[PDB]
């Protein structure tokens, strides 16, 4: 795919360009308004695994470099995860070969919304020291191949780098409890919803100590989302039946040995009401 | 200087891009029509050691990569020579690599257009003589772009020494009209002296018949090649190191009254018709008489 090639080329280019820039002791407000653009035009030269004409744009390289550092990701390991071996594809979504990272395509409007809140997000990551249930935004890019702009967003993978997820839920806490379609339920790993969760009498057995840490994190993250006037997010719930930042192991007493994976996902009826109902639903899980 | 920074950035970029491309078993005619262009536009980023806006163009990367190989220069050593340490600035726009193995000369857009028409003829010639020539060794051709100027840069193997300092310098043409270095020129540390200066100083090159035969055979072919391309107005660069690898160096003969190392190459080979046979014969009559 031309896009993945340009994307991998671009990540290698931007990290190498960053390798020359010393990291600043502080991010200035203009670093949130910053971008790096490269336009390649090869005439009769490279026609192999990479197109002759393309553009690549990295948004706020200083901001995302610092966010990576806060999330404990070295710039070199980030590059290796993304480029040493090709990423695998899902249904537009990719996972790094090592399963540590995830690359999601987003729209131009999603990028515009992400810019308005990038400073508020950075300030929040500083305050909670990278310890959050929110997506860890690691890179934001625009790849251009044959009059087609694709906006790519790199995030830490919420699911395991080794353990396979056996059951998947998208929890919202909506008053009208949504259900996965007939078409969805025939897949190997369907994304089940609230009504599916309730109908299956599913419970998460993690123990009061881990639950307290989880609920405190969630409450702040959701309060932060409400302050940004954000709604329609979900709790991604992954269950593994018997390096992982979002993983919580089954309590010693649990009737089933499981590893749960939980994070906030569609963060791009008013916000206050969304949150209370959201938090009421996953507190009862 | 923004230009040197963009140039060094670009050389590092193009060599790394070349490091991914397997070298072809043969150069196709399109490789002589080829180029690599990169346009950078950084907004509210960098601002230290490099410009926010710039363009870099490498002409015929496959042709110049192969020419380097023929001249026995590995792509990695070429990159190190040019970028590990900054090049020193001489006079024109002319730079020398830190290690003194390479030389970078600014040229004009017309010079580049002339160089393209003859790049295939030059490559064919280098193949025939196995990189053993008195001509400049063209290693890279680039166009560096900044806010108010487009600069065409040409990398060549340095004709002078990488260790030994040149004590006397000549630009020999064999011109019917007397060529002499000006008053202003002669007050410099290393003036470029000309034909009349050479003759007035009763200058001689003491090399020995064996080395002279190799030199004159090389020169005759190179000049025949230049004439075939309708080229004239070239010069023989003569460098003399007075005694207390260099490709163009020839040491003094055992019999010589002075121990010296001479450095000789063909240099202003970009001029054409707008007569070459007459130029060549007049020129060769002059340099054989040394
Ligand atoms: C199964 C998995 C999904 C997933 C995921 N999804 C996701 C994150 C953020 C957003 S956004 C840009 O709208 O905030 C949207 C989707 N992110 C990390 N790991 C995993 S694993
Ligand atoms: C003192 C020195 C000059 C010099 C030199 N000059 C030069 C070569 C080629 C041309 S061109 C593009 O018109 O062919 C013009 C000038 N080239 C290599 N080493 C040295 S050392």
Author numbering:
A (entry chain A): 45 to 135, 140 to 290, 351 to 376, 403 to 419
B (entry chain B): 45 to 136, 140 to 291, 351 to 380, 404 to 419
Text taken from the publication that reported this structure:
To solve structures of PI5P4Kγ as cocomplexes with examples from this chemical series, a truncated version of human PI5P4Kγ comprising residues His32 to Ala421 was cloned into a bacterial expression vector. In both chains, 15 binds deeply in the hydrophobic cleft that forms the ATP binding site in lipid kinases. However, 15 binds in a position in which the heterocycle is rotated approximately 90° within the plane from the cofactor position. A hydrogen bond is formed between the ring sulfur and the side chain of Asn205 and also between the N1 nitrogen and the main chain NH of Met206. The hydrogen atom attached to C2 makes an aromatic hydrogen bond to the backbone carbonyl of Arg 204. The methyl group extending from the 6-position of the thienylpyrimidine ring makes contact with the side chain of Lys216 and also the phenyl ring of Phe207. The methanesulfonylphenyl moiety then runs deep along the back of the binding cavity, forming mainly hydrophobic interactions with residues Lys152, Met203, Ile373, Asp374, and Leu376. The pocket where the sulfone of 15 is located is lined with lipophilic residues: Val154, Phe185, Leu201, Met203, Ile375, and Leu376. The sulfone does not make clear H-bonding interactions in the crystal structure, although a hydrogen bond with the backbone NH of Ile375 is possible. The activation loop formed from residues 377–402 is disordered.
